[PDB]
Amino acid sequence: ELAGNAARDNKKTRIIPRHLQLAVRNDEELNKLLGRVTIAQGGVLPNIQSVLLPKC
């Protein structure tokens, strides 16, 4: 269900692990179930520390 919504955003009809890793990581609750599992070819969540960004 969470994965399917992600596939909608990228518009691909076929579900893909990149969706799966993305889906199960945004939900903080489901995150706790798999806090020590790594998905094949999952890729990290898109995140950047604010300080790294330019001052303005």
Partner DNA sequence: GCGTACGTGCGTTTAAGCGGTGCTAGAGCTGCCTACGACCAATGGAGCGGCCTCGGCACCGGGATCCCCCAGCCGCCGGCAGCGCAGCGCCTGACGGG
CA distances from 25 to 12, 52, 55 (A): 20, 22, 29
Residue 44 backbone phi and psi in degrees, to 5: -75, 165
Which one of 4, 5, 8, 12 is in contact with DNA (CB under 7 A)? 12
Count the residues in the chain.
Answer: 56
| Contact flag: residue 8 with DNA (CB under 7 A) | no
Residue 13 or 47: the one with the smaller Cβ distance to DNA is 13
Residue 10 or 31: the one with the smaller Cβ distance to DNA is 10
CB of 49 to DNA, least distance (A): 16
